[PDB]
Structure of Uracil-DNA glycosylase:
Amino acid sequence: MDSLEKIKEEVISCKKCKLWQFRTNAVPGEGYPKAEIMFVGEAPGENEDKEGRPFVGAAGKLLTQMIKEILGLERDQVFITNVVKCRPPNNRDPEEDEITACSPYLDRQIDIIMPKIIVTLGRHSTKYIFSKMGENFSSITKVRGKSYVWKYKEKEIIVFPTYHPAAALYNPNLRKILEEDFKKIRELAITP
Ligand code: SF4
């Protein structure tokens, strides 16, 4: 039967799409297998590629800070991953065939963890999860900051889209919006 360990093993030696040729390390994701909160980003950047870990760059450090200061959590209490797990060449967006190739890893991760809340960071991860939900996706600007109920298997999963933290690095107002979004996420997390 499946496990997060198996997914990690498959991912780190995975050659199922053309992104494999460009990487130093695949990025399978990390954190608590019974996390109530699961963060899903787009694809790895250059620091993530170098470390084999998600959200470790400047954007990741901001994420970490918000998780600590606003949610009140350490990273090892949540689960963090990406819809695509290898860094696209020249940091382009992933292509449909790449999202198609890689996303079953994410489906499998969701299947195992069954989080209370999935926080989708940015337009790509949000659009992917919306497609699995069967929810119409317009733009990240239009859907961010709202909770969506995803009936999945026996559970309701709350999906909460927001901006990617990299977008908040040099934009004070957008960072204030992300912070407010994380406040709503904490409220969702602590409410029965
Ligand atoms: S991006 Fe995903 S499917 Fe493509 S090689 Fe990396 S782990 Fe495999």
